[PDB]
Amino acid sequence: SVPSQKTYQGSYGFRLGFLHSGTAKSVTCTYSPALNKLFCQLAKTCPVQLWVDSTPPPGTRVRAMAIYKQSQHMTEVVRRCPHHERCSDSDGLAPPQHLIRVEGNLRAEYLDDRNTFRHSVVVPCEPPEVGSDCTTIHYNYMCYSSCMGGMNRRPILTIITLEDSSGNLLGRDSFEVRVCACPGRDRRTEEENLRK
Numbered sequence: 001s002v003p004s005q006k007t008y009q010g011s012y013g014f015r016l017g018f019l020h021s022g023t024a025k026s027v028t029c030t031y032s033p034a035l036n037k038l039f040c041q042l043a044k045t046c047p048v049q050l051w052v053d054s055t056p057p058p059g060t061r062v063r064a065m066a067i068y069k070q071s072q073h074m075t076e077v078v079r080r081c082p083h084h085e086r087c088s089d090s091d092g093l094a095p096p097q098h099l100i101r102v103e104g105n106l107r108a109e110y111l112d113d114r115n116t117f118r119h120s121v122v123v124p125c126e127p128p129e130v131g132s133d134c135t136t137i138h139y140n141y142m143c144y145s146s147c148m149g150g151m152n153r154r155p156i157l158t159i160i161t162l163e164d165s166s167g168n169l170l171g172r173d174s175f176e177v178r179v180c181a182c183p184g185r186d187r188r189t190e191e192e193n194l195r196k
């Protein structure tokens with residue numbers, strides 16, 4: 001009733017990477033290593049790098065799923081709020097209830113789990129372009145952390161799983177997410193709180 005969040009590099013040495021975008025007022029997505037937390041604006045591009053030490057088999061896929069971080073909410077499905085699920089902002093592929101979308105990948109598949117009712121989005125795992133050492137997926141988060149009737153100020157984690165063609169686990173990584181109006185200021189504030 002609760003997906004695992006344990007970091008697991010697996011046989012291929014799977015792990016995530018993030019750009020260094022800074023904390024300027026104007027930044028739209030920024031990652032804090034000290035907090036293991038991504039701060040982003042609503043529906044803006046969030047680049048997430050995928051790194052491996054060795055090449056996984058054809059048919060490997062990469063899935064993203066959100067869960068609530070606090071244990072007393074972790075059995076509740078993370079979904080879009082009653083306003084955003086009805087705002088008709090579909091991209092033609094993502095169900096309107098799903099918080100996490102993949103941008104610019106026509107092979108993305110969206111799952112409503114028939115047993116847990118949790119949402120996820122999965123894409124085929126492709127090698128880097130020539131000249132690149134990693135692959136990048138572009139995610140969008142489609143509600144604010146503050147949305148009433150949805151996340152309602154509760155922190156979430158995103159769990160990224162590397163899976164075989166049957167859906168079996170090959171690797172796992174995760175990060176906290178805050179979707180907010182001013183990610184640069186919020187990252188600075190939370191990093192200073194941590195240091196204090």
Ligand SMILES: CN(C)Cc1ccc2c(c1)c1ccccc1n2CC(F)(F)F
Nearest residue numbers: 050051052053055125126127133134135
């Ligand atoms: C092995 N390093 C140095 C390069 C590298 C980095 C990421 C790579 C690959 C290769 C690669 C090859 C085939 C299929 C998917 C691949 N990916 C994405 C994945 F990390 F697995 F999510």
Ligand SMILES: [Zn+2]
Nearest residue numbers: 081084143147
């Ligand atoms: Zn919302």
